[PDB]
Design a protein around this nucleic acid. Structure first.
Ligand SMILES: [Mg+2]
Ligand SMILES: [Zn+2]
Ligand SMILES: [Zn+2]
Ligand SMILES: [Zn+2]
Lengths: 196, 159, 559, 49, 141, 65, 43, 263, 133, 102, 114, 84
RNA sequence: AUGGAGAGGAC
């Protein structure tokens, strides 16, 4: 996550070659999607990135203090003296191909944080395991190696589709299927089946 | 309010009218007033519509209001669904809300009602009224671990 | 509720989910580790015995493999231990619990599970790395995204239960959903953005890139279409190549605002058989909409071929885009010199107009709007003067962003954003409001202690005169913070009330089905509808059509 | 850089969390409903601490 | 020396506060079009002056660069999330024995900062790195 | 937590430039940008590698064992 | 840690709402979402 | 000579800045990726630790050692461990270096790649010496140790390819640029009022003629002439980067030609 | 194979309707009074001034996938300056004595209006419009 | 048979207006062989469009009203979720009762 | 943890052959060669080259999923010219330009200073 | 009683839930190598078989449709139209 | 194992 409520997880990793490159050889550590910007009006991100770029080139420390007279225009003049186009953009080249990118890309340093919530701590899978004694159903939790709730809401979904053998199977051959003996008279499980 | 209505010549034209809007409701008496069109009068209270012009026009107006919520919000849900709900509130005879008061009263097999809101009191006087249970309820067969009569389970297969 | 109407269950898995421009629509990328755990019993049969003995040879932890062979007696040979994992003849009739494999049908789900479309049968594709992977176009019925959401997967254990999935629940056969008698999935984000990019009348593609794109669509007949331009250098048109993705006998016609079979604005849409005749391709066509491509193609050629359609439209557009690029910066929140000075002088003529009312109202020459306070009338007039201020200043900034403006290019494509996003980023964010009113006096007669008492002027009461680009002041900050907390609350509070509404609607309608007489009933055989929906039809098979007996002159009707 | 402010109980570090309440010994008036008889109420929580 | 006073919410009710020492009270006077629009003095009957407006934020939000250009809910979302950002939690992690300790290999004092970070020791105990990052539609992954 | 042996993004060795960067800063007074340039840390990606760097290990050594 | 040491809790007419008088005592941004929103505050 | 053409404008121990005439864009780029990721090198790819009573954790140090630029000149006569018939490693396919440092002084003691020590038998090859471009002749700062501390480990450097870990890249950044005034309209510039005044001219605009408003667009044009500059990190001298670059590209284009024959 | 319409036109309107590569062009035949033309030209390939005067033709000829050419080595059927390949999508009676046909060259559109025209423009897959000079 | 003639009215109204003689021959000049297809289709496509006995059409309605209720969030009337809480609650004292008079 | 080894990018697996050549069914005299363990570095360089050879009617390559180092070249040629030759020639041509590019670079370098 | 073969009221068509269940059921029989009734043309998949066996009307099962009141009509998979 | 608490993830 950047520092502006833009969370997001990895989707792929490309090596330096396959990555798009600035003319001076620079390649990003990171590619986020322009579709994360307009609906979330998260302009600080866009400014911190441009501020951050001048700091780096200039060797100063970009002040993003709240209520200040630091100004996207005034950062842009500073970035322009540094030889770069004053709004972030840089022409870049597709890496598969060497061909120029048609569009120019907003390119810059931007503080990014790594969050707890990595997959190999969430990833769980169960094809039958341990059960509670009271309900003879699966135990709860990945740490205990348990199954996932088939909730009323998921039961409704299967009812809506009209998938009845599956809604049955999910609630019998998974989970807690069981065989009992009933009296054809009183109708309770009173029977003493001395089976065998 | 603007209004579309047939023209002297056929084409639907914009011919706008003066409409009146109220804080508060007395349908019983405002329709009986002189000077107005008692044929076209409306309240958002569908609970008065039901009282004054009866159950069928109540249904029609309970929908009009449900539709109006979805629509006011931009969305569009197909009519058959909102109709089905509206029709389901409306067939007991009066308005039958979607609570333990409304639908969860209605002599449908005990196990079915017990799966909503009032679990035990439902199962208690189901014991003391000695109720029989159909077992056609989706949710009774959920419990028994049997195949529900639901698409796929709605019929039988043979030779 | 928590133990009968709902059980924790076997053969299930959960992980993070991410997106994949190269999975088919109805595919699901399953980590090889999860693939290796979840199982399916298969009976041994002369048709599979070679594949099955072979999967046993692999055993319990080398992908296409198995654990447990189950015998006549139904005892449990356990292939991780067991001195005879190496032996093993396979009598017809023993089950083999094999790993999950490619094209096994599985049931995929994201919670909360609000519609039938929230659990769908995908086709498994076992893949490296630990995320599940879905097509982006299966994103909405799940209401998923990849900021860390997670999804479950449930593997069917009998022959008929996988049947039930691939025949009733399969992702293709859900594309056009009964909810709204329209498609519930369409082209989104990158693809939707770049398809509009690709189809501009300016977007010409030349030979190399035309044969690459052409190769990318796999249903391609191997026939280069004749370039729109031959003349000085053979160019192809964006419209042209994308039309390779679209099937045959797909007819579609539209007309927006300008459009006139010369579509001078490249407006609307005309697709005369599998070839696009005129018009920029955007959301109204390729989105998840009523009259659109996906509606037509599904009905016209079958879900199968339409499911395949998503695939093709992305493989090409996504490619073309990888090699065009597209992006946004603070560049596109900068409106003009001249435009800034107008925005400022618009805002000010609203500030200097709220003053006049406040002047007049104080002087006792303001009249009540019939049935409401003097004070209510004042507030109403002031909030209108300041809402229209914010809109006029927004619309003024929207007019000055060029076609090459990235924010404006997403709006056009319909991929993200809207007038208010532009408005608040460049012009003026507008009036902060809590509980339907502008900011209250939290202290006696003032709003913050940096104001004097009894001051109702724009700023004092919550007007954020600034834009996000220019930046909110201290006062403005706090105020806009107040308004935002209100939204955060009743977003946390919305999900709670709705979560219930739902449970009741469902529990109350639970057992209403359509019986073999087209009658709508319930556990009591009570009649709800004599013919379902009044017309007996299924909402998936219904489309808006105009009954043109109904309008026009009595003359033109007879004519 | 450790800042203190916490305790250590059986190895485990605890933070006491600031708890919010109304002041005592302060007089507040409250308009009340309209399916009600008692139409205004002036009330005081009486603290000794 | 009576140059600074402590004011609680109840007394705050009786005073008029200036927001910025200078700007908000020298006498009476062209402009920069880029700079956000201010209001003025008006009412000049002060009793107190803000120490600094950026002080209204607490600890977690004090990290957000240019929060005054973000839509509020985001500033909130980043507040929940700054707390779950790996980096050095204390210099003595080698000698503690906590269940669970995550330490980022190569922490990095962020390139854009906040005057308040100074007192929060964020630059000495950072949690986050400075990725050269690109906003672009690329492979579509 | 010691200078990165290698700028991430691009690959330049920046491991050997720490020691020396401290000397340019303190011993002949230079300013960070200038000091960075003299190290041949020209493109801004290897140029943040060092300026944003924080040498926690100088605190870590303080503990005795 | 720094945040947690400086937290507020409020048990149980419009309490979650950020109220004018919070100015400068309580942080206007830092609160949790859902559940505890506006009830757990930070100094 | 005959085909594709080179002009070197500048050249150092670390940078060759050239112009590459008369070539396809496909070749100019493909060469650049090969240079980034497919020229073999030597790097520590195994560390056996025997003590580390250091502030830093075992695999953290192991990691730094990997990144340390080791002389890889004679590399084409070292083998791949995977290929070589020894069990694990040998002198034919791996250089082994040793590290010991103990803090003796009160003043913080440093550990530099200078302090690494070849221990296997190089047998004539010029390989494995850790590269030092540092002014005082101690390259890279592996870690620091306080008075009592000790670190005692043993590396086996092996032949490797940047594709497999970026530690093996002879790499550093490679600048690349054609058609410096968009005479091909390969980009379309983003502007607020003026394309030209807002984008800055690239240095390589002295080398081409500007297009003149008075002209119409040259649609026959292809990308020729590519302004590159390869920076080496040292494990190979710059000239060798671009030559082994060309050498390898040709090598693995060759295997394709060969493979047609086999099958 | 063969010609299907010929005439000379005089341009009366260039239009860069927010493009930098295409232009809706308006013209009139220098022969027929009952005759106008509107056309989308790639003005970056074959640039067109106002008051220009272009020769315009429709062939149908000199489908198998488009082999890359060797044209003064083949039958170029042109020696024209500018040549597109489109489809016909509507045939509209402006009534009388007055018939117009509509052409799409991958989205570059053209509408031509006349009378004797008809007796030669079939409802067809066809048409390579050619221009010169 | 009357429920059947009822159910099908609105669709015929359309059919009859589209397949009316002046129009068939004039607007879209069908040939006899094509027309017989245009019928043959319509009947098939229609039949395909009937709802299938088995359809748990109840659950499907709850969800179909339920789901978009969840995408609801924000000058007279109580609207949105709070309105929908009222409608389904048959609330006796609604927050905005109102007459509309013509 | 579910990551495939990195070497699987460039080493061949259990009896993976380097090339596979298949008769494309769509059009005549056309072939679809699959290259196991390569990517753009090679597949673009051959495509670009096959296009200068004038008896080539179609050439395009594509990396179908990037988890995997494998691409596909589809090639079509004028009747009488077998596709493989089209590639065969295309490769040598590349090698010769590169053989030239090499010596042309050296003689340049042997002329410098610093 | 029952309910007579002349005067059946319900769709002569086969509902999608019928189909799913017939295919399901036959795939379950086939998977257990009960005998196969058509010309398995390579096709080795138990369900993919049942589909071919159904497209050839050689599935000998019968559908017992329950009307709400307890009445019911039998149709054969032989005689139901499979459109959809 | 059970029983309770608290923090936190997704809408
Ligand atoms: Mg989410
Ligand atoms: Zn009994
Ligand atoms: Zn760098
Ligand atoms: Zn060896």
């Amino acid at each position: 996550a950047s520092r502006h409520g833009q969370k997001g997880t990895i989707g792929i990793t490309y090596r330096r070659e396959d990555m798009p490159f600035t003319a001076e050889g620079i390649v990003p550590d990171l590619i986020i999607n322009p579709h994360a910007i307009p609906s979330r009006m998260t302009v600080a991100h866009l400014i911190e990135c441009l501020l951050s770029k001048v700091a780096a080139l200039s060797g100063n420390e970009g002040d993003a203090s709240p209520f200040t007279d630091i100004t996207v225009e005034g950062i842009s003049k500073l970035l322009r003296e540094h030889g770069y186009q004053s709004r972030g953009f840089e022409v870049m080249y597709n890496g598969h191909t060497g061909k120029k990118l048609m569009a120019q890309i907003f390119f810059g340093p931007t503080y990014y944080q790594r969050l707890r919530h990595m997959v190999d701590d969430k990833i769980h899978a169960r094809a039958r395991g341990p059960m509670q004694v009271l309900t003879r159903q699966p135990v709860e939790g990945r740490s205990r190696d348990g199954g996932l709730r088939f909730g009323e809401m998921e039961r409704d979904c299967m009812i809506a589709h009209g998938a009845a053998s599956f809604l049955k199977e999910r609630l019998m051959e998974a989970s807690d299927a069981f065989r009992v003996h009933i009296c054809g008279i009183c109708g309770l499980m009173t029977v003493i089946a001395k089976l065998n | 309010y603007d209004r579309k209505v047939p023209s002297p010549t056929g084409e639907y034209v914009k011919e706008p009218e003066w409409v009146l809007e109220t804080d508060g409701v007395n349908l019983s008496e405002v329709m009986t007033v002189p000077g107005i069109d008692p044929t076209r009068i409306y309240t958002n209270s569908f609970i008065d519509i039901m009282e004054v012009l009866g159950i069928e026009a109540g249904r029609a107006a309970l929908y009009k209001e449900v539709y109006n919520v979805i629509a006011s919000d931009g969305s569009y849900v197909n009519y058959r669904h909102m109709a089905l709900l509206v029709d389901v509130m409306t067939t007991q005879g009066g308005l039958t809300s979607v609570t333990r008061h409304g639908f969860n009263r209605s002599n449908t097999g005990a196990l079915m009602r017990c799966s909503f809101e009032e679990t035990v009191e439902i199962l208690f006087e189901a014991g003391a009224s000695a109720e029989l249970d159909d077992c056609r309820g989706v949710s009774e067969n959920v419990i028994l671990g049997q195949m529900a009569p639901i698409g796929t389970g709605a019929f039988d297969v043979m030779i | 509720r928590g133990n009968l109407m709902g059980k924790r269950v076997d053969f299930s898995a959960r992980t993070v989910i991410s997106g994949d421009p190269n999975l088919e629509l109805d595919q699901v990328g399953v980590p090889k580790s999860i693939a290796k755990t979840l199982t399916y019993p298969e009976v041994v049969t002369p048709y599979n015995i070679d594949r099955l003995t072979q999967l046993v040879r692999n055993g319990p932890n080398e992908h296409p493999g198995a654990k447990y062979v189950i015998r006549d007696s139904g005892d449990r040979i356990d292939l991780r231990y067991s001195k005879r994992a190496g032996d093993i003849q396979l009598q017809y009739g023993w089950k083999v619990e094999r790993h999950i494999m490619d094209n096994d049908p599985v049931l995929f789900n994201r919670q909360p599970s609000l519609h039938k479309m929230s659990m769908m049968a995908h086709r498994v594709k076992v893949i490296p790395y630990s995320t599940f992977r879905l097509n982006l176009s299966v994103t909405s019925p799940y209401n998923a995204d990849f900021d860390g959401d997670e999804m479950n997967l449930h593997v069917p254990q009998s022959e008929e239960t996988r049947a039930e999935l691939s025949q009733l629940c399969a992702v293709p056969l859900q594309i056009v959903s009964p909810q709204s008698n329209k498609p519930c999935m369409g082209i989104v984000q990158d693809t939707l953005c770049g398809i509009r990019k690709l189809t501009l009348r300016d977007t010409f593609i030349e030979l190399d890139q035309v044969l690459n794109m052409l190769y990318w669509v796999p249903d391609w007949d191997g026939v280069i279409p004749t370039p729109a331009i031959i003349k000085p250098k053979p160019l192809w048109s964006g419209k042209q190549i994308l039309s390779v993705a679209i099937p045959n006998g797909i007819h579609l016609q539209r007309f927006d605002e300008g459009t006139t079979l010369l579509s001078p604005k490249d407006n609307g849409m005309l697709i005369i058989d599998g070839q696009i005749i005129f018009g920029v391709v955007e959301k109204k066509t390729v989105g998840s909409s009523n009259g659109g491509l996906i509606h037509v193609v599904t009905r016209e050629k079958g879900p199968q071929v339409c499911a395949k359609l998503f695939g093709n439209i992305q493989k090409v557009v996504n490619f073309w885009l990888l090699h065009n690029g597209f992006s946004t910066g603070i560049g596109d929140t900068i409106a003009d010199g001249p435009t800034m000075r107008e925005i400022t002088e618009t805002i000010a003529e609203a500030k200097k107009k709220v003053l006049d009312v406040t002047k007049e109202a104080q002087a006792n020459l303001l009249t009540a709007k019939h049935g409401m306070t003097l004070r209510e009338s004042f507030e109403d007039n002031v909030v209108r003067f300041l809402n229209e201020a914010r809109d006029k200043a927004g619309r003024l900034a929207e007019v000055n962003l060029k076609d090459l403006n990235n924010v404006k290019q997403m709006v056009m494509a319909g991929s993200k954003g809207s007038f208010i996003n532009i408005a608040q980023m460049s012009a003026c964010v507008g009036q902060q409001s809590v509980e339907g009113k502008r900011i209250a006096f939290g202290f006696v007669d003032r709003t913050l202690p940096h104001f004097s008492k009894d001051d109702y002027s724009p700023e004092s009461k919550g007007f954020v005169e600034n834009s996000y680009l220019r930046g909110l002041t201290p006062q403005e900050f706090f105020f806009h913070a107040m308004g935002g907390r209100e939204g955060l609350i009743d977003t946390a509070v919305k999900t709670a009330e709705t979560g219930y509404i739902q449970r009741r609607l469902v529990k109350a309608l639970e057992d209403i089905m359509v019986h073999y007489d087209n009658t709508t009933r319930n556990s009591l055989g009570n009649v709800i509808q004599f013919i379902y929906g009044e017309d007996g039809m299924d909402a998936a098979h219904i489309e808006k059509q105009s009954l043109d007996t109904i309008g026009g002159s009595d003359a033109a009707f007879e004519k | 850089f450790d800042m203190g402010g916490y305790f250590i109980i059986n190895g485990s570090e605890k933070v006491l969390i600031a708890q919010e309440r109304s002041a005592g010994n302060i007089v507040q008036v409250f308009k009340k409903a309209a399916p009600s008889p008692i139409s205004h109420v002036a009330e005081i929580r009486s603290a000794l601490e | 020396e009576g140059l600074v006073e402590y004011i609680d919410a109840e007394e705050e009710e009786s005073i008029l506060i200036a927001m910025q020492p200078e700007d908000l009270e020298p006498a009476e006077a062209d402009v920069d079009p880029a700079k956000r629009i201010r209001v003025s003095h008006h009412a000049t009957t002060f009793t107190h002056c803000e120490i600094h407006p950026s002080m209204i934020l607490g600890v977690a939000a004090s990290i957000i660069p240019f929060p005054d250009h973000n839509q509020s809910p985001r500033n909130t979302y980043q507040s929940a999330m700054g707390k779950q950002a790996m980096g050095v939690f204390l210099t003595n992690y080698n000698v503690r024995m906590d269940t669970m300790a995550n330490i980022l290999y190569y922490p990095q004092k962020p390139l854009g900062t906040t005057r308040a970070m100074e007192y929060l020791k964020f630059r000495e105990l950072p949690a986050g790195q400075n990725a050269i990052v690109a906003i672009a539609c690329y492979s579509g992954y | 937590m010691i200078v990165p042996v290698r700028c991430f993004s691009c690959g330049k060795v920046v491991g050997d430039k720490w020691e020396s960067y401290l000397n340019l800063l303190q011993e002949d007074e230079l300013d960070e940008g200038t000091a960075l340039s003299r190290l041949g840390l020209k493109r801004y990606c290897c140029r943040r590698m060092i300026l944003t760097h924080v040498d926690l290990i100088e605190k870590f050594l303080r503990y005795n064992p | 840690t720094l945040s947690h040491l400086r937290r507020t809790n409020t048990p149980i007419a419009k309490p979650r709402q950020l109220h004018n008088t919070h100015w400068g005592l309580v942080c206007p941004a830092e609160t949790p979402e859902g559940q505890a929103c506006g009830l757990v505050k930070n100094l | 000579e005959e085909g594709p053409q080179v002009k070197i404008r500048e050249a150092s121990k670390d940078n060759v800045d050239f112009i590459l005439s008369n070539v396809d864009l496909a070749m100019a780029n493909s060469l650049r990726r090969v240079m980034i990721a497919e020229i073999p090198t030597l790097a520590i790819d195994s560390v056996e630790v025997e003590t580390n009573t250091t502030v830093l954790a075992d695999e953290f140090i192991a990691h730094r050692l990997g990144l340390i630029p080791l002389q890889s000149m004679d590399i084409e006569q070292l083998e791949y461990s995977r290929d070589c018939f020894c069990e694990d490693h040998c002198d034919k396919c791996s250089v082994v270096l040793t590290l010991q440092a103990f803090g003796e002084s009160e003043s913080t003691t440093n550990v530099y790649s200078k302090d690494l020590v070849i221990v296997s038998n190089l047998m004539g090859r010029n390989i494995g010496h850790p590269i030092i471009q540092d002014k005082e002749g101690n390259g890279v700062l592996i870690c620091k140790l306080r008075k009592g501390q000790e670190l005692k480990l043993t590396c086996v450097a092996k032949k490797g390819i940047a594709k497999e870990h970026a530690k093996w890249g002879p790499a550093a950044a490679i600048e690349f640029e054609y058609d410096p005034w968009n005479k091909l309209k390969h980009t379309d510039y983003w502007y607020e009022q003026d394309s030209a005044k807002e984008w800055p001219q690239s240095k390589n605009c002295e080398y081409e003629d500007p297009p003149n408003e008075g002209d119409p667009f040259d649609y026959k044009a292809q990308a020729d002439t590519f302004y590159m500059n390869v920076e080496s990190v040292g494990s190979i001298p710059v000239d060798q980067v671009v030559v082994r670059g060309i050498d390898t590209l040709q090598k693995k284009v060759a295997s394709i030609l060969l493979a047609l024959t086999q099958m | 194979s063969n010609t299907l319409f010929d005439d000379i036109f005089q341009v009366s309107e260039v239009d860069p309707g927010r493009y930098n590569k295409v232009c809706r062009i308006e013209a009139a035949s220098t022969t027929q009074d009952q005759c106008k033309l509107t056309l989308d030209i790639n003005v970056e390939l074959f640039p067109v001034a106002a008051q220009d005067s272009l020769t315009v033709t429709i062939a149908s000829s000199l489908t198998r996938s488009w082999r890359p050419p060797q044209a003064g080595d083949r039958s170029l059927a042109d020696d024209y300056d500018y040549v597109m390949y489109g489809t016909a999508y509507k045939f509209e009676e402006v009534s009388k004595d007055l018939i117009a046909v509509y052409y799409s060259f991958g989205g570059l559109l053209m509408r031509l209006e006349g009378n004797y025209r008809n007796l030669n423009n079939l409802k067809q897959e066809n048409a390579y419009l050619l221009i010169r000079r | 048979q009357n429920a059947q003639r009822d159910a099908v009215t609105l669709f015929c109204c359309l059919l009859r207006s589209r397949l009316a003689t002046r129009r068939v021959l004039q607007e879209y000049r069908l040939t006899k062989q094509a027309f017989d297809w245009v019928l043959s289709n319509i009947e098939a496509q229609f039949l395909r469009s009937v709802v299938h006995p088995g359809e748990m059409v109840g659950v499907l309605a709850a969800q179909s009203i339920g789901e978009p209720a969840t995408q609801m969030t924000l000058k007279k009337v109580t609207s949105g979720v709070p309105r929908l809480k009222e409608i389904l609650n048959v609330a006796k004292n609604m927050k905005t009762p109102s007459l509309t008079v013509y | 943890m579910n990551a495939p080894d990195r070497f699987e990018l460039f080493l061949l697996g259990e009896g993976e052959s380097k090339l596979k050549i298949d008769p494309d069914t769509k059009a005549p005299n056309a072939v679809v060669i699959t290259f196991e363990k390569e990517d753009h570095t090679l597949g673009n360089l051959i495509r670009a080259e096959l296009l200068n050879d004038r008896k080539v009617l179609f050439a395009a390559y594509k990396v179908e999923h990037p988890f995997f180092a494998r691409f596909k070249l589809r090639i079509q040629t004028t009747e009488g010219y077998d596709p493989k030759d089209a590639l065969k020639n295309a490769c040598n041509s590349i090698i010769n330009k590169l053989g030239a590019l090499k010596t042309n670079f050296e003689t340049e370098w042997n002329l410098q200073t610093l | 009683k029952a309910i007579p073969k002349d005067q059946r009221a319900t769709t002569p068509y086969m509902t999608k839930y019928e189909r799913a269940r017939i295919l399901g059921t036959r795939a379950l029989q086939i998977s257990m190598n009960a005998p196969v009734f058509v010309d398995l043309e390579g096709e080795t998949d138990p369900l993919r078989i049942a589909m071919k066996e159904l497209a050839e009307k050689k599935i000998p099962l019968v559908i017992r449709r329950y009307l709400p009141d307890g009445s019911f009509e039998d149709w054969s998979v032989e005689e139901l139209i499979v459109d959809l």
